[PDB]
Amino acid sequence: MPREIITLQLGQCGNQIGFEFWKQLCAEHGISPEGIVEEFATEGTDRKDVFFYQADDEHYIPRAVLLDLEPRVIHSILNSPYAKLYNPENIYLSEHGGGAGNNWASGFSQGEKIHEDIFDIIDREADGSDSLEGFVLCHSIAGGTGSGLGSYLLERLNDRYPKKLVQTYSVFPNQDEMSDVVVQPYNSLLTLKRLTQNADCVVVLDNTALNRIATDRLHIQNPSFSQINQLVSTIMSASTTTLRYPGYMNNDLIGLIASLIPTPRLHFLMTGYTPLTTDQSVASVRKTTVLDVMRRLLQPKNVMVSTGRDRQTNHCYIAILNIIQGEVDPTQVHKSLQRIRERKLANFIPWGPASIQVALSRKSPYLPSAHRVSGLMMANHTSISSLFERTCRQYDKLRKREAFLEQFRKEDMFKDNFDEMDTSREIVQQLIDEYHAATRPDYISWGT
Amino acid sequence: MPREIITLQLGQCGNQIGFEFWKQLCAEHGISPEGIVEEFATEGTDRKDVFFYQADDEHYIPRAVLLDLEPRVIHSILNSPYAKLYNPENIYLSEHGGGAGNNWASGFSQGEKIHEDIFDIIDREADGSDSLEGFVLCHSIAGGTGSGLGSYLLERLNDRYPKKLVQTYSVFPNQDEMSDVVVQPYNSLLTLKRLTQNADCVVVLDNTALNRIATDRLHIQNPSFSQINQLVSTIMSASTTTLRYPGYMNNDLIGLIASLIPTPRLHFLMTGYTPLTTDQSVASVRKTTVLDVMRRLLQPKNVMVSTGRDRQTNHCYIAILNIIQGEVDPTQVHKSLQRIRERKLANFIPWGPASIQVALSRKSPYLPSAHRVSGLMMANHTSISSLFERTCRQYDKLRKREAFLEQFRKEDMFKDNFDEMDTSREIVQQLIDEYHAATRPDYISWGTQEQ
Amino acid sequence: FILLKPVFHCLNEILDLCHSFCSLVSQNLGPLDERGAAQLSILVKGFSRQSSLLFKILSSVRNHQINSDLAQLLLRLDYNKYYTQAGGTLGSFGM
Amino acid sequence: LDVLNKKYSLLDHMQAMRRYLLLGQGDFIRHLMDLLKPELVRPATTLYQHNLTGILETAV
């Protein structure tokens, strides 16, 4: 049976991302806005049962759970044409609509308040899943609902499904913009805490990186939230193509991520996408070779993570997996790997075996691909610590400034102290340092 | 990977020379003014990656940086058909457009003011080079912008790229024309200082010799700057031919020049080109022999440097490299070298082994050649010191006349003293003396601490 | 590599060692007991020896220029040259 | 002669020998030697044929 995936959309940002993801998945699978397979979608070669459930022999419903503490966004999703695609029994909307007030502690307390309802929804969805692998949480770490409610949900999923895998698609706040949410580092700290203790792998999605890519690479002067969500949904689709087009390898998400996380702490993944094109640059179909494809992928402009330039730590890639979709000549892939090693385009960990994994994947038959060849890069790169170090610095700056803690002190989770935020900041600092060690040969003795 | 070459075009004259050089390179490689390879440019035998980068799958962009302190010339270049040939990120135009006012000190101060931005542009271009050999600077030493900014750029390149080679195409002031720039000898002195301290190779371009050749050799009654620039572009093309026609030897600029520069101080090269012809004489394909080629190259009337007849110093050729392009029989080359040696047509240094190097080169297939055979001469000749001696005499005349020093005292480089000019004069005097010493068998101990 | 009888047999032994290691890891939910630790040490030594044998085989084939594809596989394995730095032996599992 | 040229490219094989085996592609040889310098300086016992072949292909 397929490894079913529950998609959890948390808070305003998480719910918007989930909605755009479900829209993109429906479009890629030729699923009507009601969840019905379009008559043209005769190629039954996609594996919907991994991420979607069938409502009937013809209608595929996404295994997605949309969670918000404010009713406005959930109602706006339910007011879209795609309202009927999702199973309504998997949709929990907070009646109070008040949100978490951008308070992580409030979001966590709300999760605790909706614990019974949320776990009933989760159990109902689990019974609808024949071979549920786990849950995928889409949320922001800076707000209250997506951060606090997301952390509460992660805690309760870990408690209820301690033997089940928990993957997250975690949208990190933009670090280059001054956040008006002074307590965002507290929210971010609590989310990083929950990812550290109860998640096995955290995929960091930096809104700063999204904005930077949209401006410099997509040539979007004012990137809308919708355009970023559509880029993220496209990335998720590309990441799930190998799940939807079964082959010899990487037939499951857990099988895909197992190779990336050598140690429980080394769960920070970097992403890459191919072909990467500016919205304006669709015009010229470049006869890119697998070597040419990988070369463009090896360009930092094509990496889906904007890691800061750490000057002190010789950050390196711990591991790289390239999932390439489309017409690929294997000899061109081999030459690409040869050139990458010869050109030393990627530095790998010195303390263990590391390579660039290359996956060749079929495209979804239900989604017409404008590109002959597409590719995802998954990489473990120590430069992600520069994002993590920046988050740690922001956490320390907020705790040292007690910024926005008075609003958190109103909530029981943060009423007496911010010790959970300080411990999270210390853990994130240790994580950055460990990632720097993993860039070093002494990673072999790291933790000894 | 190819040894990439970054082309730096400095000031009005340098930028014009660079633009004409890029035009000539495009013509030789069959590159359109838009940067697209012409359909006829099917001979993939040229190494564009030495001097050009591919901007797209179709567009090859020269690794050339066009730098001017006045916006008029840069705008005129950007208004040319070749506007799309150059990387727009490699075009720096001073917003003030005012130039350096023909003041080396002003040019240097402006270079210091734009040092960060210029070096950021340079680093951005450098990261695009897989195996960058070094930078080539085209500038004049007599003006303010190309001279002062050239010295600033040389200093900053030496600081930032201390392991990279620095070759220059340095336009030296006309020694036969009275310069209106009374401080040109000061500008020339500062430029020579930087060339001695911060350049690794200086190609001397004397506007006096260029004008003399244009008048006497090109039969131009009133030589335009454009005709001089076209001669310079021909010279640069010949200098890049070994990059454009890869072969068994001298396949890299450092590999090519290594045989020519025996000592770090002996880095002043003289050039020769052959055949020099007026456009009208294309008609008759003369079956020129290698011996005939070398003989015509050996004529001082054909030398692209106007050295005076020094009667006091027995100036001699230190080394000769002949780059010959076209149909050449190697056995004819051997017999020609034998005959040249037998005739003792050139005097060499007595203190070390010296010979005439001969390079045979193919012509560009993308550029139709009106001449079956073309040739470059590279020579080290002690009479080049007389050019430096003449510049020194002009420097001494200006300092003794305090000419135009009030404009330099306004700039910090000359505000308190002219010690940089005096040190440059002393270094140039030592250079002249060593070149005279290098003409003698006692050159073996020239420059030795015992000496 | 089905035709490479000595290589095929060495690979089969490596695969069986991997299966035994996976069984040992599956049997111990917690830290390895003394028996589990001894089995782990034996497996580590076996794996390092078999990977050194693999590297030796690859070098012998290089000397014989017999198979490009085996060299490609070895190159893929030693992409970070970790195994090359480890001398072709599978890296010591740090206990 | 026609058969040798069309089916075995005998003259083309000789021209290839000139360009590559006779080091006619001198830039290629230069770049190869530059890449080999860190390898050719190493002890010969430490050379991996796979690495040298990959360097050769990369230089090509």
Swiss-Prot record, chain A:
Disulphides: none
Modification sites for Phosphoserine: 131
Presence of keyword Protein biosynthesis: no
Signal sequence annotation: none
SUPFAM superfamilies, sorted: Tubulin C-terminal domain-like, Tubulin nucleotide-binding domain-like
Quaternary structure note: Component of the gamma-tubulin ring complex (gTuRC) consisting of TUBGCP2, TUBGCP3, TUBGCP4, TUBGCP5 and TUBGCP6 and gamma-tubulin TUBG1 or TUBG2. TUBGCP2, TUBGCP3, TUBGCP4, TUBGCP5 and TUBGCP6 assemble in a 5:5:2:1:1 stoichiometry; each is associated with a gamma-tubulin, thereby arranging 14 gamma-tubulins in a helical manner. Gamma-tubulin at the first position is blocked by TUBGCP3 at the last position, allowing 13 protafilaments to grow into a microtubule.
Role according to the record: Tubulin is the major constituent of microtubules, protein filaments consisting of alpha- and beta-tubulin heterodimers. Gamma-tubulin is a key component of the gamma-tubulin ring complex (gTuRC) which mediates microtubule nucleation. The gTuRC regulates the minus-end nucleation of alpha-beta tubulin heterodimers that grow into microtubule protafilaments, a critical step in centrosome duplication and spindle formation.
Name of the protein: Tubulin gamma-1 chain
Swiss-Prot record, chain C:
Expression by tissue: Ubiquitously expressed.
Localization terms from the record: Cytoplasm, Cytoskeleton, Microtubule organizing center, Centrosome
Subunit (UniProt): Component of the gamma-tubulin ring complex (gTuRC) consisting of TUBGCP2, TUBGCP3, TUBGCP4, TUBGCP5 and TUBGCP6 and gamma-tubulin TUBG1 or TUBG2. TUBGCP2, TUBGCP3, TUBGCP4, TUBGCP5 and TUBGCP6 assemble in a 5:5:2:1:1 stoichiometry; each is associated with a gamma-tubulin, thereby arranging 14 gamma-tubulins in a helical manner. Gamma-tubulin at the first position is blocked by TUBGCP3 at the last position, allowing 13 protafilaments to grow into a microtubule.
Function per UniProt: Component of the gamma-tubulin ring complex (gTuRC) which mediates microtubule nucleation. The gTuRC regulates the minus-end nucleation of alpha-beta tubulin heterodimers that grow into microtubule protafilaments, a critical step in centrosome duplication and spindle formation.
Disease: Microcephaly and chorioretinopathy, autosomal recessive, 3: A disorder characterized by congenital microcephaly and chorioretinal dysplasia associated with poor vision and nystagmus. Variable ocular anomalies include microphthalmia, retinal folding, retinal detachment, optic nerve hypoplasia, absence of retinal vessels, round areas of chorioretinal atrophy, and attenuated electroretinogram. Most patients have mild developmental delay and mild learning difficulties.
Family membership: Belongs to the TUBGCP family.
Name of the featured protein: Gamma-tubulin complex component 4
Curated annotation (Swiss-Prot), chain D:
Compartments in which it is found: Cytoplasm, Cytoskeleton, Microtubule organizing center, Centrosome
Domain of life, per lineage: Eukaryota
Tissue: Ubiquitously expressed.
Family (UniProt): Belongs to the TUBGCP family.
Role this protein plays: Component of the gamma-tubulin ring complex (gTuRC) which mediates microtubule nucleation. The gTuRC regulates the minus-end nucleation of alpha-beta tubulin heterodimers that grow into microtubule protafilaments, a critical step in centrosome duplication and spindle formation.
Subunit structure: Component of the gamma-tubulin ring complex (gTuRC) consisting of TUBGCP2, TUBGCP3, TUBGCP4, TUBGCP5 and TUBGCP6 and gamma-tubulin TUBG1 or TUBG2. TUBGCP2, TUBGCP3, TUBGCP4, TUBGCP5 and TUBGCP6 assemble in a 5:5:2:1:1 stoichiometry; each is associated with a gamma-tubulin, thereby arranging 14 gamma-tubulins in a helical manner. Gamma-tubulin at the first position is blocked by TUBGCP3 at the last position, allowing 13 protafilaments to grow into a microtubule.
Protein's name according to its UniProt entry: Gamma-tubulin complex component 3
Organism: Homo sapiens
Primary gene name: TUBGCP3
Whole sequence portion shown: 546 to 605 of 907
